[PDB]
């Protein structure tokens, strides 16, 4: 085998956002921010917020996230690039990716490409925070 | 000449790790994992992680790897056996080996023996992924 979750750099996600799709295959993507208590202060524009603490405790919440991702994929070309992140993408981001992975059948996983955003929202804001076109709800004072 | 870079079987590397030195000349060795995005899910214990993408982009990072390898070679007996690998060892592992090779001057090269791990971490995982004594951070869910 090879692996079914990989890292994605903020610079790549940013390019995809600028271009409207992944660059090479022109595939759709969807950011999933899994922060709970530290979500405030900014998030990536157009991402979905499903706190990992709830996804892990609430099976219907995980089902909803999976449904929503599969539905979006059915509407687009190729595989849907799902990008999980939390604050650092060290614990919650990767755990949430694996929680979704475990819930995907073979047919469903082949419809997706699963990513963790390297560095989390912390790294994202450091270069992209101020740009309201890619970052929603940025509170620069929260980062002093 | 004969060649400066060759493939090494993962069975041989595992033996070197158990015994603590190479088989014929009892030389030291150092694993260099050059995966970037697909590093997630496990790696060889005690290896160093220098993504090929960064090694190519940032001469200072390449200079760091070289300086670190040469300082370790100074700390041991005989040539240091440097084992590069990536996921499949078809492209990045060999290109990384060649980047280092090109940076090494005459005497530096004499102090090293360069290897690429046949089959990459993909092959390693299939046989040793479960063995926590030789594999660190393994995430079986990623290899389904
Ligand atoms: Cl939402
Ligand atoms: N080379």
Coordinates of C-alpha atoms and ligand atoms in Angstrom, one line a residue:
Chain A
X1 CA 0.0 0.0 0.0
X2 CA 0.5 3.7 0.1
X3 CA -1.1 6.0 2.6
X4 CA -4.7 7.4 2.6
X5 CA -4.1 10.6 4.5
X6 CA -1.3 13.0 3.6
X7 CA -0.2 16.5 4.6
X8 CA -1.1 19.6 2.6
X9 CA 0.9 22.9 2.9
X10 CA -1.0 26.2 3.5
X11 CA 0.6 27.5 0.3
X12 CA -1.1 24.7 -1.7
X13 CA -4.5 25.2 -0.1
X14 CA -4.1 28.9 -0.9
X15 CA -3.3 28.3 -4.6
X16 CA -6.4 26.0 -4.7
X17 CA -8.5 28.7 -3.2
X18 CA -7.1 31.3 -5.6
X19 CA -7.8 29.1 -8.6
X20 CA -11.1 27.6 -7.5
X21 CA -10.0 23.9 -7.7
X22 CA -6.8 21.9 -7.3
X23 CA -4.3 23.0 -9.9
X24 CA -3.4 19.9 -11.8
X25 CA -6.7 17.9 -11.8
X26 CA -9.0 20.8 -11.3
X27 CA -10.7 18.8 -8.5
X28 CA -13.0 20.2 -5.8
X29 CA -11.9 20.7 -2.2
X30 CA -13.5 21.2 1.2
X31 CA -11.8 22.5 4.4
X32 CA -13.0 21.1 7.7
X33 CA -11.9 23.0 10.8
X34 CA -12.2 20.7 13.9
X35 CA -11.3 23.3 16.6
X36 CA -13.6 23.6 19.6
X37 CA -12.6 26.0 22.3
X38 CA -9.9 27.8 20.2
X39 CA -12.0 28.4 17.1
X40 CA -12.6 32.1 17.7
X41 CA -10.3 34.7 16.0
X42 CA -10.6 33.7 12.4
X43 CA -11.2 30.6 10.2
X44 CA -10.5 29.7 6.6
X45 CA -13.1 31.2 4.2
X46 CA -15.8 28.6 3.0
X47 CA -14.5 25.9 5.4
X48 CA -17.0 23.9 7.6
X49 CA -16.7 23.8 11.3
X50 CA -17.1 20.4 13.0
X51 CA -15.4 20.4 16.4
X52 CA -13.5 17.1 16.9
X53 CA -14.7 16.9 20.5
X54 CA -18.2 16.6 19.2
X55 CA -17.4 14.4 16.2
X56 CA -15.8 11.8 18.5
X57 CA -18.7 11.9 21.1
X58 CA -21.7 12.3 18.7
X59 CA -22.0 9.6 16.0
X60 CA -24.8 11.5 14.2
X61 CA -22.5 14.5 13.9
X62 CA -19.8 12.4 12.2
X63 CA -22.5 10.9 9.9
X64 CA -23.6 14.4 9.0
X65 CA -20.1 15.5 8.1
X66 CA -19.5 12.3 6.0
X67 CA -22.9 12.7 4.3
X68 CA -22.2 16.3 3.5
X69 CA -18.7 15.5 2.1
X70 CA -20.1 12.6 -0.1
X71 CA -22.9 14.8 -1.4
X72 CA -20.5 17.6 -2.4
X73 CA -18.3 15.0 -4.1
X74 CA -21.2 13.7 -6.2
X75 CA -21.7 17.2 -7.6
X76 CA -18.1 17.7 -8.7
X77 CA -15.5 16.3 -11.0
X78 CA -13.0 13.7 -9.7
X79 CA -12.3 13.1 -6.1
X80 CA -13.1 15.5 -3.4
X81 CA -10.1 16.8 -1.5
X82 CA -11.0 16.9 2.2
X83 CA -8.7 19.1 4.2
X84 CA -8.8 18.7 8.0
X85 CA -7.1 21.0 10.4
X86 CA -7.2 22.3 13.9
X87 CA -5.0 24.9 15.6
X88 CA -1.6 23.1 15.1
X89 CA -2.8 20.0 13.1
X90 CA -0.8 17.8 15.5
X91 CA -3.6 16.1 17.5
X92 CA -7.2 17.0 16.7
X93 CA -6.8 17.6 12.9
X94 CA -5.1 14.2 12.3
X95 CA -7.5 12.4 14.8
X96 CA -10.6 13.8 13.0
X97 CA -9.2 12.7 9.6
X98 CA -8.7 9.2 10.9
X99 CA -12.2 9.3 12.6
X100 CA -13.7 10.1 9.2
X101 CA -11.5 7.5 7.4
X102 CA -12.6 4.7 9.6
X103 CA -16.2 5.5 8.6
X104 CA -15.7 5.4 4.8
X105 CA -16.3 2.2 2.8
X106 CA -13.9 1.3 -0.1
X107 CA -16.1 3.0 -2.8
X108 CA -16.4 6.1 -0.6
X109 CA -12.7 6.5 0.2
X110 CA -11.8 6.2 -3.5
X111 CA -14.0 9.2 -4.1
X112 CA -11.9 11.3 -1.7
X113 CA -8.4 12.4 -1.1
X114 CA -7.9 13.1 2.7
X115 CA -5.5 15.8 3.9
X116 CA -4.3 17.4 7.1
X117 CA -3.3 21.1 6.7
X118 CA 0.3 21.2 7.9
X119 CA 0.7 23.7 10.8
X120 CA -3.0 24.2 11.3
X121 CA -4.8 27.5 11.5
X122 CA -1.9 28.9 13.4
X123 CA 0.4 28.7 10.4
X124 CA -2.4 29.8 8.0
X125 CA -3.1 33.0 9.8
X126 CA 0.6 33.9 10.0
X127 CA 0.7 34.5 6.2
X128 CA -3.0 34.7 5.2
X129 CA -4.9 36.1 8.3
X130 CA -5.3 39.7 7.0
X131 CA -6.8 38.6 3.6
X132 CA -10.6 38.6 4.1
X133 CA -11.0 36.9 0.7
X134 CA -9.4 33.6 2.1
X135 CA -9.8 34.2 5.9
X136 CA -13.2 34.9 7.5
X137 CA -13.7 36.6 10.9
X138 CA -10.0 37.3 11.5
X139 CA -9.4 39.1 14.8
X140 CA -5.8 40.3 14.6
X141 CA -5.7 41.4 18.2
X142 CA -6.4 37.7 19.3
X143 CA -2.9 36.9 17.8
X144 CA -0.8 39.5 19.7
Chain B
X1 CA 34.7 3.4 -11.6
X2 CA 31.9 1.3 -10.2
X3 CA 28.9 3.3 -8.9
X4 CA 28.5 5.6 -5.8
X5 CA 24.8 4.9 -5.2
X6 CA 23.1 1.4 -5.0
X7 CA 19.9 -0.1 -3.7
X8 CA 19.8 -1.8 -0.3
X9 CA 17.2 -4.5 0.6
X10 CA 15.0 -3.6 3.6
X11 CA 15.9 -7.1 5.1
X12 CA 19.6 -5.9 5.2
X13 CA 18.7 -2.6 6.8
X14 CA 16.6 -4.3 9.5
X15 CA 19.6 -6.6 10.2
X16 CA 21.8 -3.5 10.4
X17 CA 19.4 -2.0 12.9
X18 CA 19.3 -5.1 15.1
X19 CA 23.1 -5.6 15.1
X20 CA 23.8 -1.8 15.4
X21 CA 26.2 -1.6 12.4
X22 CA 26.5 -2.9 8.7
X23 CA 27.2 -6.6 8.1
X24 CA 30.5 -6.8 6.3
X25 CA 32.6 -3.9 7.6
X26 CA 30.7 -3.3 10.8
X27 CA 30.2 0.4 9.7
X28 CA 27.7 2.9 11.0
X29 CA 24.6 3.9 9.1
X30 CA 22.0 6.6 9.1
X31 CA 18.5 6.5 7.6
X32 CA 17.2 9.7 5.8
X33 CA 13.5 9.8 5.0
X34 CA 12.9 12.3 2.2
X35 CA 9.1 12.1 2.1
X36 CA 7.1 15.3 2.3
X37 CA 3.3 15.1 2.1
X38 CA 3.3 11.3 2.5
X39 CA 5.4 11.1 5.6
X40 CA 2.3 10.8 7.8
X41 CA 1.5 7.2 9.1
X42 CA 4.9 5.9 10.3
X43 CA 8.6 6.1 9.7
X44 CA 11.8 4.1 10.4
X45 CA 13.0 4.4 14.0
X46 CA 15.9 6.7 14.5
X47 CA 15.9 8.0 10.9
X48 CA 16.2 11.7 10.1
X49 CA 13.5 13.4 8.2
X50 CA 14.6 15.9 5.3
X51 CA 11.8 16.3 2.7
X52 CA 13.2 16.1 -0.8
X53 CA 11.0 19.1 -1.8
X54 CA 12.8 21.3 0.8
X55 CA 16.3 19.8 0.1
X56 CA 15.8 20.9 -3.5
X57 CA 14.3 24.4 -2.7
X58 CA 16.7 25.4 0.1
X59 CA 20.5 25.0 -0.3
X60 CA 20.9 25.7 3.4
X61 CA 18.8 22.7 4.3
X62 CA 20.8 20.5 2.0
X63 CA 24.0 22.0 3.5
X64 CA 22.5 21.1 7.0
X65 CA 21.9 17.4 6.1
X66 CA 25.4 17.1 4.7
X67 CA 27.1 18.8 7.7
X68 CA 25.1 16.5 10.1
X69 CA 26.0 13.3 8.2
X70 CA 29.7 14.3 8.1
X71 CA 29.8 15.1 11.8
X72 CA 28.3 11.7 12.6
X73 CA 30.8 10.0 10.3
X74 CA 33.6 11.7 12.3
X75 CA 32.0 10.1 15.4
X76 CA 32.3 6.5 14.2
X77 CA 34.6 3.9 12.5
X78 CA 34.8 3.7 8.8
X79 CA 32.5 5.2 6.2
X80 CA 29.0 6.2 7.1
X81 CA 26.3 4.3 5.2
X82 CA 23.6 6.8 4.4
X83 CA 20.3 5.2 3.4
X84 CA 17.9 7.4 1.6
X85 CA 14.3 6.5 1.0
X86 CA 10.9 7.9 0.1
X87 CA 7.5 6.1 -0.3
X88 CA 8.5 3.9 -3.3
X89 CA 12.2 4.8 -3.6
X90 CA 11.7 5.2 -7.4
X91 CA 12.0 9.0 -7.7
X92 CA 12.5 11.2 -4.6
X93 CA 14.9 8.8 -2.7
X94 CA 17.2 8.5 -5.6
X95 CA 17.0 12.3 -6.5
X96 CA 17.8 13.1 -2.8
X97 CA 20.8 10.8 -2.9
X98 CA 22.0 12.6 -6.1
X99 CA 21.5 16.1 -4.5
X100 CA 23.7 15.1 -1.6
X101 CA 26.2 13.4 -3.8
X102 CA 26.6 16.6 -5.9
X103 CA 27.4 18.6 -2.7
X104 CA 30.1 16.2 -1.5
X105 CA 33.6 17.1 -2.4
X106 CA 36.3 14.5 -3.1
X107 CA 37.2 13.7 0.4
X108 CA 33.7 14.0 1.8
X109 CA 32.5 11.4 -0.7
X110 CA 35.3 9.0 0.4
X111 CA 33.8 9.1 3.9
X112 CA 30.3 8.0 2.8
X113 CA 28.6 5.0 1.1
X114 CA 25.3 6.0 -0.4
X115 CA 22.2 3.8 -0.5
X116 CA 18.6 3.9 -1.6
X117 CA 16.2 1.6 0.3
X118 CA 14.6 -0.7 -2.2
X119 CA 10.8 -0.5 -2.2
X120 CA 10.8 2.6 0.1
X121 CA 8.7 2.9 3.3
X122 CA 5.8 1.2 1.4
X123 CA 7.8 -2.1 1.4
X124 CA 9.2 -1.5 4.9
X125 CA 5.6 -1.1 6.3
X126 CA 4.4 -4.3 4.7
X127 CA 7.0 -6.4 6.7
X128 CA 8.1 -4.3 9.7
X129 CA 5.2 -1.8 10.1
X130 CA 3.9 -3.6 13.2
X131 CA 7.3 -3.9 14.9
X132 CA 7.6 -0.9 17.2
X133 CA 11.3 -1.7 17.8
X134 CA 12.1 -0.7 14.2
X135 CA 9.1 1.4 13.2
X136 CA 8.0 4.6 14.9
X137 CA 4.5 6.3 14.7
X138 CA 2.9 3.6 12.6
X139 CA -0.9 4.3 11.9
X140 CA -2.3 1.1 10.5
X141 CA -5.6 2.9 9.5
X142 CA -3.6 4.9 6.9
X143 CA -2.4 1.7 5.1
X144 CA -5.7 0.0 4.7
Ligands
LIG1 CL1 -20.9 24.2 8.1
LIG2 N1 23.5 13.1 -9.2

